[PDB]
C-alpha cells in the first residue's frame, strides 16, 4: 500500500494544476475589468468630443442592507424583506436588477439602505464576510476548494471566480448569489452621517437607493 507520498503526489501535483488555472483566470478578469472601466472613461470623453452626451447603461446589480429593526413592520414589506433574505438588521444581500425585483425594492425602501457596489466593496465583502450555504450550515469560504465543491457545477472554482460572477451579473448569477449567506455587517464605524435614519437618503435620512454612496457605507459597516 503506497500512497505515502504516491497518491499524495498524485494530488498535490494536481493541486498545483488547479491554482494555475485560477491564476490565469484571475489575471484575465483584471484585463476585462479595467479595460472595460477604461472603455467607458474614453466613451464619456469621445461623446463629449462630439458634443453628444454619453449615458452609461442602467446599473444591473445592487447591494441592499436591512436598516430597520425587526418589529412593527407591515405585512407586505415584511414578506419582501424575507424573500430578499434580509431578516435581521444590518444584514445585506445582492440583488440583480430587473423590473420584477425593482418593484420589490420599491416596496421595502423605508426599511433598507441600498445602492451600487464597486468591485472594491464586492471584493472585500466576499473576502472578509463571505460564507457559503452548504446543507444550511453556513460555511466560511477561506479555501477555494469549498467553492469549487458547490459552485464548480457552473464554472466558478475560486473565490474570485465567485466575485466575477456577482459583479458582472453572470448567467449563473442566481445560483452564484444565493450561494452566499446574507452578509452580516456591523454598524457603521463613523455613524450614519445623519441625525435621523428613517427618512429617505434624499431627505437626509438613510433609506432608499443612495446609488454609488452605498460603497462608503457598506465599507464602514464591514
Amino acid at each position: 500500500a503506497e500512497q505515502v507520498a504516491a497518491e499524495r503526489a498524485a494530488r498535490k501535483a494536481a493541486n498545483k494544476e488547479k491554482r494555475a488555472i485560477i491564476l490565469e483566470r484571475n489575471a484575465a478578469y483584471q484585463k476585462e475589468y479595467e479595460t472595460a472601466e477604461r472603455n467607458i472613461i474614453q466613451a464619456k470623453r469621445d461623446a463629449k468630443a462630439a458634443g453628444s452626451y454619453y449615458v452609461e447603461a442602467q446599473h444591473k446589480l445592487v447591494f441592499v442592507v436591512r436598516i430597520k429593526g425587526i418589529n412593527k413592520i407591515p405585512p407586505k414589506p415584511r414578506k419582501v424583506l424575507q424573500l430578499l433574505r434580509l431578516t435581521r438588521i444590518n444584514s445585506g444581500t445582492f440583488v440583480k436588477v430587473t423590473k420584477a425585483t425593482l418593484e420589490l425594492l420599491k416596496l421595502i425602501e423605508p426599511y433598507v439602505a441600498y445602492g451600487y457596489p464597486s468591485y472594491s466593496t464586492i471584493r472585500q465583502l466576499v473576502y472578509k464576510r463571505g460564507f457559503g450555504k452548504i446543507n444550511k450550515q453556513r460555511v466560511p469560504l477561506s479555501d477555494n476548494a469549498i467553492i469549487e465543491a458547490n459552485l464548480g457545477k457552473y464554472g466558478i472554482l475560486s473565490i474570485d471566480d465567485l466575485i466575477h460572477e456577482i459583479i458582472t451579473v453572470g448567467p449563473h448569477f442566481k445560483q452564484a448569489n444565493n450561494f452566499l449567506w446574507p452578509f452580516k455587517l456591523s454598524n457603521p464605524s463613523g455613524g450614519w452621517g445623519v441625525p435621523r435614519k428613517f427618512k429617505h437618503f434624499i431627505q437626509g435620512g438613510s433609506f432608499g437607493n443612495r446609488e454609488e454612496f452605498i460603497n462608503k457605507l457598506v465599507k464602514s459597516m464591514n
Binding site: 491554482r19 494555475a20 485560477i22 491564476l23 484571475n26 489575471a27 483584471q30 479595467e34 477604461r38 474614453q42 470623453r45 469621445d46 463629449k48 468630443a49 462630439a50 458634443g51 472585500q124 473576502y127 472578509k128 466560511p140 469560504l141 477561506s142 479555501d143 477555494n144 475560486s158 473565490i159 474570485d160
Partner: protein
C-alpha cells in the same frame, strides 16, 4: 476553527487567489493610465456655462 481574514494575513491571501503576488509584484494597484488629449466640443462647454 478560526476564520482568518485575508485583506490582512498575507498567508491566506495567497491561499485564495494566487494572483495577488503578481498583482502586487507589478504595482498593479497604481496603474498609470495612458494619456490622451481629447478636447470637448464647444456645444458642451457653452451649454455647461449657460444660464
Amino acid at each position: 476553527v478560526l476564520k482568518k481574514n485575508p485583506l490582512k494575513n498575507k498567508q491566506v491571501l495567497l491561499r485564495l487567489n494566487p494572483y495577488a503576488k503578481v498583482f502586487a509584484a507589478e504595482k498593479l494597484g497604481s496603474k498609470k493610465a495612458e494619456k490622451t488629449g481629447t478636447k470637448p466640443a464647444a456645444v458642451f462647454t457653452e451649454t455647461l456655462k449657460h444660464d
